[PDB]
Write a protein that holds these residues in place. Structure first.
Motif, PDB file in Angstrom:
ATOM      1  N   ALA A  10      -0.451  -2.528   5.216  1.00 18.98           N
ATOM      2  CA  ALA A  10      -1.781  -2.393   5.805  1.00 18.98           C
ATOM      3  C   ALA A  10      -2.472  -1.117   5.337  1.00 18.98           C
ATOM      4  N   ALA A  11      -1.718  -0.024   5.206  1.00 16.72           N
ATOM      5  CA  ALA A  11      -2.301   1.215   4.712  1.00 16.72           C
ATOM      6  C   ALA A  11      -2.785   1.068   3.275  1.00 16.72           C
ATOM      7  N   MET A  12      -1.995   0.398   2.431  1.00 12.57           N
ATOM      8  CA  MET A  12      -2.417   0.200   1.051  1.00 12.57           C
ATOM      9  C   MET A  12      -3.615  -0.726   0.976  1.00 12.57           C
ATOM     10  N   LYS A  13      -3.651  -1.750   1.829  1.00 15.34           N
ATOM     11  CA  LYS A  13      -4.802  -2.642   1.838  1.00 15.34           C
ATOM     12  C   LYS A  13      -6.067  -1.893   2.227  1.00 15.34           C
ATOM     13  N   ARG A  14      -5.974  -1.030   3.236  1.00 11.43           N
ATOM     14  CA  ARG A  14      -7.139  -0.269   3.662  1.00 11.43           C
ATOM     15  C   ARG A  14      -7.648   0.638   2.552  1.00 11.43           C
ATOM     16  N   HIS A  15      -6.747   1.149   1.712  1.00 12.15           N
ATOM     17  CA  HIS A  15      -7.099   2.059   0.632  1.00 12.15           C
ATOM     18  C   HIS A  15      -7.477   1.346  -0.660  1.00 12.15           C
ATOM     19  N   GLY A  16      -7.603   0.022  -0.637  1.00 15.71           N
ATOM     20  CA  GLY A  16      -8.163  -0.706  -1.763  1.00 15.71           C
ATOM     21  C   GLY A  16      -7.179  -1.161  -2.819  1.00 15.71           C
ATOM     22  N   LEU A  17      -5.881  -1.206  -2.516  1.00 16.83           N
ATOM     23  CA  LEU A  17      -4.912  -1.585  -3.540  1.00 16.83           C
ATOM     24  C   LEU A  17      -4.710  -3.086  -3.676  1.00 16.83           C
ATOM     25  N   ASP A  18      -5.101  -3.880  -2.683  1.00 15.98           N
ATOM     26  CA  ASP A  18      -4.888  -5.317  -2.764  1.00 15.98           C
ATOM     27  C   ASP A  18      -5.747  -5.887  -3.884  1.00 15.98           C
ATOM     28  N   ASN A  19      -5.089  -6.452  -4.897  1.00 15.49           N
ATOM     29  CA  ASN A  19      -5.724  -7.019  -6.079  1.00 15.49           C
ATOM     30  C   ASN A  19      -6.372  -5.971  -6.980  1.00 15.49           C
ATOM     31  N   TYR A  20      -6.021  -4.696  -6.816  1.00 19.06           N
ATOM     32  CA  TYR A  20      -6.562  -3.659  -7.683  1.00 19.06           C
ATOM     33  C   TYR A  20      -6.051  -3.866  -9.098  1.00 19.06           C
ATOM     34  N   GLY A  22      -6.038  -6.467 -10.574  1.00 17.05           N
ATOM     35  CA  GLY A  22      -5.355  -7.742 -10.588  1.00 17.05           C
ATOM     36  C   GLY A  22      -3.960  -7.758 -10.005  1.00 17.05           C
ATOM     37  N   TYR A  23      -3.509  -6.670  -9.375  1.00 13.67           N
ATOM     38  CA  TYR A  23      -2.156  -6.606  -8.821  1.00 13.67           C
ATOM     39  C   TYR A  23      -2.228  -6.845  -7.321  1.00 13.67           C
ATOM     40  N   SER A  24      -1.666  -7.973  -6.883  1.00 12.72           N
ATOM     41  CA  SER A  24      -1.666  -8.317  -5.474  1.00 12.72           C
ATOM     42  C   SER A  24      -0.889  -7.278  -4.672  1.00 12.72           C
ATOM     43  N   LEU A  25      -1.158  -7.262  -3.364  1.00  3.52           N
ATOM     44  CA  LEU A  25      -0.607  -6.229  -2.491  1.00  3.52           C
ATOM     45  C   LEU A  25       0.910  -6.181  -2.549  1.00  3.52           C
ATOM     46  N   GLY A  26       1.565  -7.343  -2.613  1.00  8.14           N
ATOM     47  CA  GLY A  26       3.018  -7.361  -2.644  1.00  8.14           C
ATOM     48  C   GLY A  26       3.610  -6.588  -3.808  1.00  8.14           C
ATOM     49  N   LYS A  96      -4.226   4.561  -8.736  1.00  4.05           N
ATOM     50  CA  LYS A  96      -5.313   3.776  -9.319  1.00  4.05           C
ATOM     51  C   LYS A  96      -5.631   4.259 -10.721  1.00  4.05           C
ATOM     52  N   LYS A  97      -5.568   5.572 -10.938  1.00  6.23           N
ATOM     53  CA  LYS A  97      -5.772   6.102 -12.281  1.00  6.23           C
ATOM     54  C   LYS A  97      -4.657   5.663 -13.224  1.00  6.23           C
ATOM     55  N   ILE A  98      -3.406   5.701 -12.752  1.00  8.39           N
ATOM     56  CA  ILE A  98      -2.268   5.322 -13.582  1.00  8.39           C
ATOM     57  C   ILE A  98      -2.356   3.861 -14.002  1.00  8.39           C
TER      58      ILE A  98
END
Ligand code: CL
Ligand code: CL
Ligand code: CL
Ligand code: CL
Ligand code: NA
Length: 129
Positions: A10-20, A22-26, A96-98
């Protein structure tokens, strides 16, 4: 802080990582599990003298300054200690930069060897997001 699986999802989803990129949250949860066992305070020293920091084990050779990796870069423009915080913001912003640098999540050895090509959705199953 040692996160629970769904708490970190949930923390990663809130910070915009889900599908960032193209990489799904899992994918991100799987990588954190095997890089750090969900522990924001994890550190590990590499053979070249650099050190990996935090929940995503970000390396001081390229991404942060720890004052003891000579000739290294600080591409995330942060002290490495900021990656050990209970607040994952700095780790997420640097990741996100990496992941955008051309190599995707292959930058994370544990992701490549233990998450890539597996059913990573299993890592967010049951979680309330
Ligand atoms: Cl997923
Ligand atoms: Cl340094
Ligand atoms: Cl957080
Ligand atoms: Cl990619
Ligand atoms: Na550095």
């Amino acid at each position: 802080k040692v996160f629970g699986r769904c708490e970190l999802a949930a923390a990663m989803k809130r910070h915009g990582l889900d599908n960032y990129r193209g990489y799904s949250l899992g994918n991100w949860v799987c990588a954190a599990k095997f890089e750090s066992n969900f522990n924001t305070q994890a550190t590990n020293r590499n053979t070249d003298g650099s050190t990996d920091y935090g929940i995503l084990q970000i390396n001081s050779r390229w991404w942060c300054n720890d004052g003891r990796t000579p000739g290294s870069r600080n591409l995330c423009n942060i002290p490495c200690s900021a990656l050990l915080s209970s607040d994952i913001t700095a780790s997420v912003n640097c990741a996100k930069k990496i992941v955008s640098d051309g190599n995707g999540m292959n930058a994370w050895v544990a992701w490549r060897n233990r998450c890539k090509g597996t059913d990573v959705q299993a890592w967010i199953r049951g979680c309330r997001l």
